[PDB]
């Protein structure tokens, strides 16, 4: 029991840490997707503004 309880506190702690890693990694998948979309949007806008600048050119 102590071995299963301990193996569990460790599987569970490793899990909280892996889940945290996933949570934080996911927080970053999301922060990266926000930056990617902000930058892709600025890029598409740079390209819209470029197409416009080129049209205005």
């Amino acid at each position: 029991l102590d071995k299963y309880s301990e193996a569990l506190k460790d599987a569970q702690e490793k899990l909280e840490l892996a889940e945290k890693k996933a949570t934080d990694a996911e927080a970053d998948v999301a922060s990266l997707n926000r930056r990617i979309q902000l930058v892709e949007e600025e890029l598409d806008r740079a390209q819209e503004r470029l197409a416009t600048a080129l049209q205005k050119l």
Partner: protein
């Protein structure tokens, strides 16, 4: 004959380009000093575990 028309055109272009140069001088003098910031996002990436604060 054409001295008066020449002088009139000269004064017109002189005043116009004068205003123009009053603009472009300090335009070019300060044209890089007007930059901006990067605005990067942390994305919660630089943490390898749970935060030390109460929020986590």
């Amino acid at each position: 004959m054409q001295a008066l028309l020449g002088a009139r055109a000269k004064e017109s272009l002189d005043l116009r380009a004068h205003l123009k140069q009053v603009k472009k001088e300090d335009t070019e003098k300060e044209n890089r000093e007007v930059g901006d910031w990067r605005k990067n996002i942390d994305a919660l990436s630089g943490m390898e575990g749970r935060k030390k604060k109460f929020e986590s």
